[PDB]
Design a protein around this ligand. Structure first.
Ligand code: VRB
Length: 168
């Protein structure tokens, strides 16, 4: 992004993704997990039910992405875990999730111009949860559609700047 209210319409889109995301799933938390150039994630938007810890504006350094999964998620990999305490996750992984009281999560990728911008992640905090096919599909389409909008909004801004500059 080149700013100048690009970041404005972006945040509005992130907020829509998390709001409609948690509404859809009726889960406890939905966040937008954005990467930097080193693929360190930051929660830039969060919808969370009352009584649960807010994960908003939190920097979480997880190396597994840059080391293993960046390309996979770029290809549209989805990860649905019914119970995080029975998925063979290590303690270091769990310690990131416990303060957020996570019991089950659904991870779908946000791909913008063939780059893994980030992840749309949903949390169930009260108890385990088997995510249904219809839920996974709609949730993935929510993430990818939002990403496509961001993608085409950016090219639109670049086209507008280009056309105005070269105008006779
Ligand atoms: C890979 C991995 N990390 C995450 C991170 C998150 N889950 C969430 O719910 C949230 C929002 C709070 C985040 C962020 C996920 C979902 C995955 C799975 C990717 C996939 O399988 O598609 C991962 N990270 C770790 C942490 C551990 N490994 C380390 O080297 C160090 C250091 C750690 C402690 C910080 C682990 C164990 C995994 C899974 C193993 C792997 O696939 O690499």
């Amino acid at each position: 992004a080149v700013q100048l209210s690009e970041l404005r319409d972006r945040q509005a889109i992130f907020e829509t993704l998390v709001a409609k995301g948690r509404e859809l799933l009726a889960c406890d938390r939905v966040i937008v997990y954005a990467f930097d150039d080193n693929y360190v994630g930051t929660v830039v938007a969060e919808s969370v039910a009352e009584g649960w810890p807010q994960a908003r504006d939190q920097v979480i350094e997880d190396p597994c992405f840059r080391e293993h999964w960046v390309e996979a998620y770029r290809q549209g990999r989805i990860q649905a875990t019914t119970d995080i305490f029975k998925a063979g996750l290590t303690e270091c992984h769990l310690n990131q999730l416990r303060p957020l009281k996570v019991r089950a999560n659904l991870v779908v990728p946000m791909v913008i111009d063939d780059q893994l911008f980030g992840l749309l992640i949903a949390h169930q905090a009260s108890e385990p949860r088997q995510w249904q096919e219809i839920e996974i599909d709609q949730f993935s389409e929510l993430a990818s559609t939002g990403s496509l909008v961001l993608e085409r909004l950016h090219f639109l801004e670049q086209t507008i700047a280009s056309l105005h500059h070269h105008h006779h």
